[PDB]
């Protein structure tokens, strides 16, 4: 429709600008240097913990989105805001992005590439999937291309360490190359300091061997829902978690 005003260049990669739709809704855009696919996806899934699509200008996208005012979830961690969150705070943002992938699974779609980076954070640590790496990537998946939901949880997996480190890399010291090897050996990354062994579980079981073994989102959204109630009950706050 071209009634969009460009204000904050927010990154660039293409770009992505912080707008205003025809003078009134404050959106986020996204641009592409002439040198799209996921606004095909979006049409299809529409739900509260997935980023919305607003419009787009198929001439010159400009994809046009909800605006998430704390960005990325890596960048979120690894800022200022990183060091006073506590297990409760990011076991609630694991609970959103299970049932942002709960409604991807029960809509028969696959991610593919979910991880911290591509999930953005809102106001009241809202967080919501978005962008519809060997160290993220399931072994069936990176080896022989099997990507399904089981992958994705998988994904999830690596996501909660993510948390629980509070941004940091997965696998750290190791590259691509000796996380092939490793896991593909039957090594997963130990319990995070200070996180309970019970979330360090969830997380094995996310990294199983066998892709039909590993929990749905279901599940997932469910027990992250409960979790310091039929899980934590005795839960303490600690220095970093
Ligand atoms: C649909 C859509 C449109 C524009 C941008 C995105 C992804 C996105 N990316 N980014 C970054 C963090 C600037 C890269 C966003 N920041 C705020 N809101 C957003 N929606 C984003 C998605």
């Not at 260049?9 to 404050?26: A, D, F, I, P």
């Not at 200008?57 to 805001?81: A, H, N, P, Q, T």
């Not at 990507?147 to 949880?153: A, G, P, Q, R």
Request: hydrophobic share 35%; net charge negative; charged share 25%.
């Amino acid at each position: 429709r071209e009634s969009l005003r460009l204000e904050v260049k927010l990154g660039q990669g293409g770009e992505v600008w912080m707008g205003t739709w025809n003078g009134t809704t404050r959106v986020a855009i996204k641009t592409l240097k002439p040198g799209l696919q996921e606004a095909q996806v979006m049409k299809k899934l529409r739900h509260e913990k997935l980023v919305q699509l607003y419009a787009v200008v198929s001439e010159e996208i400009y994809i046009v989105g909800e605006y998430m005012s704390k960005g990325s979830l890596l960048d979120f961690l690894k800022g200022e805001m990183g060091k006073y969150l506590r297990l409760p705070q990011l076991v609630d943002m694991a609970a959103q992005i299970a049932s942002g992938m709960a409604y991807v699974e029960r809509m028969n779609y696959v991610h593919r590439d979910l991880r911290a980076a591509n999930i953005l954070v809102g106001e009241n640590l809202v967080c919501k999937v978005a962008d519809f790496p060997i160290k993220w990537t399931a072994p069936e998946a990176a080896l022989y291309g099997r990507f399904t939901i089981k992958s994705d949880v998988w994904s999830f997996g690596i996501l909660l360490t993510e948390l629980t480190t509070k941004g940091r890399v997965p696998y750290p010291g190791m590259v691509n190359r000796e996380v092939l090897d490793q896991v593909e050996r039957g090594y997963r990354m130990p319990c995070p300091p200070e996180c309970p062994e019970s979330l360090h579980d969830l997380m094995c079981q996310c990294w199983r061997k066998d892709p039909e073994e590993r929990p749905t989102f279901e599940y997932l959204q469910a027990f992250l829902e409960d979790y310091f109630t039929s899980t934590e009950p005795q839960y303490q706050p600690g220095e970093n978690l």
